[PDB]
């Protein structure tokens, strides 16, 4: 019964998921002045040309665009990573207002939304194994700011009407995730966690410095989704973000400057 309400939101999660108060939780604030440039990170490799999207699902907390991860088709390598990480799904976190919605912050600034492209380390065989390991997942995080429309997001926005409520899904084949990336792949990286229960400390975070721009109309459509199931009182799917957690004994590294 976790969620984003007053009764069941982030401040309550520790009761069912004690790791909520752990040593490597996410998201965090990225203090740009304290992040250190690391000239050794190796180049970052996003290989999405053969991606095979399958379906879009409203899971009651966000919507997920799911991919075929039974073979190396859409993979993340390089940067801080050792080995090959397969794309399994992406989703977003967003606000009720344009000045909130991101999970990570940058010098305390919140963006309107944040995209998470979730990948798992192929050495562990399946995603359920990978989330048990400290280097199991690599999440590419991309900030969204409100301005000009993002063309590559529009196919997602257009299908949302068909998955308004929890448990609805729709076919979502032939979607190209390359259309959601910014120009630059400059990034920050740090070890962290899933930002929703079970909050497992299995993620190498790769947060891009450059946000993408989406239109007010695009993000308004996100906010028409429902957390509730069909035939239940309407609760708009907004403010599905976890706030920044303590950095503790971690360093955030920059790929640039
Ligand atoms: O850290 B997020 O990318 O927000 C969470 C991803 C996540 C994926 C599968 C199961 C539970 C959570
Ligand atoms: Zn997420």
UniProtKB/Swiss-Prot annotation:
Pfam families: Carb_anhydrase
Localization annotation: Cytoplasm; Cell membrane
Keywords noted in UniProt: Acetylation, Cell membrane, Cytoplasm, Disease variant, Lyase, Membrane, Metal-binding, Osteopetrosis, Phosphoprotein, Zinc
Cofactor remark: Zinc. Can also use cobalt(II) with lower efficiency, but not copper(II), nickel(II) and manganese(II).
Domain of life of the native organism: Eukaryota
Coiled-coil ranges (or none): none
Effect in UniProt of substituting residue 118 to A/G/I/L/S: Reduced CO(2) hydrase and p-nitrophenyl acetate esterase activities
Effect of residue 139 to G: Weakly impaired activity
UniProt-reported outcome of changing residue 195 to A/C/H/P: Strongly reduced activity
EC number per UniProt: 4.2.1.1, 4.2.1.69
Residues the record lists as binding substrate: 195-196
Phosphoserine modified-residue sites: 162, 169
Swiss-Prot/TrEMBL site (Involved in the binding of some activators, including histamine and L-histidine) positions: 89
Documented effect of changing residue 59 to V: Reduced activity
Subunit composition and interactions: Interacts with SLC4A4. Interaction with SLC4A7 regulates SLC4A7 transporter activity. Interacts with SLC26A6 isoform 4 (via C-terminus cytoplasmic domain).
Note: Target of drugs used in treatments against glaucoma disorder and breast cancer.
The name this protein goes by in its record: Carbonic anhydrase 2
Phylogenetic classification of the source organism: Eukaryota, Metazoa, Chordata, Craniata, Vertebrata
Name of the gene: CA2
């Amino acid at each position: 019964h976790w969620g984003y309400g007053k009764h069941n939101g982030p401040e309550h999660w520790h009761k069912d998921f004690p790791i909520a108060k752990g040593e490597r939780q996410s998201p965090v604030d990225i203090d740009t002045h304290t992040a250190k440039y690391d000239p050794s990170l190796k180049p970052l490799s996003v290989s999405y040309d053969q991606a095979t999207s399958l379906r879009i699902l409203n899971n009651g907390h966000a919507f997920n665009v799911e991919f075929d991860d039974s073979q190396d088709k859409a993979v993340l390598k390089g940067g801080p990573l050792d080995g090959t990480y397969r794309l399994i799904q992406f989703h977003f976190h967003w606000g009720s207002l344009d000045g909130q919605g991101s999970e990570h912050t940058v010098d305390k600034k919140k963006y309107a939304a944040e995209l998470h492209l979730v990948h798992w380390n192929t050495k562990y065989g399946d995603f359920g194994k990978a989330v048990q390991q400290p280097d199991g997942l690599a999440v590419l995080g991309i900030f969204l700011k409100v301005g000009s429309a993002k063309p590559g997001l529009q196919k997602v926005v257009d299908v949302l009407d068909s998955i308004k409520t929890k448990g609805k899904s729709a076919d979502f084949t032939n979607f190209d995730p390359r259309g959601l990336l910014p120009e630059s792949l400059d990034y920050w990286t740090y070890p962290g966690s899933l930002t929703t229960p079970p909050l497992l400390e299995c993620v190498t975070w790769i947060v891009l410095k450059e946000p993408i721009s989406v239109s007010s109309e695009q993000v308004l459509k996100f906010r028409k989704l429902n957390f509730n199931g069909e035939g239940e009182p309407e609760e708009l799917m907004v403010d599905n973000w976890r706030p920044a957690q303590p950095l503790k004994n971690r360093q955030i590294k920059a790929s640039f400057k």
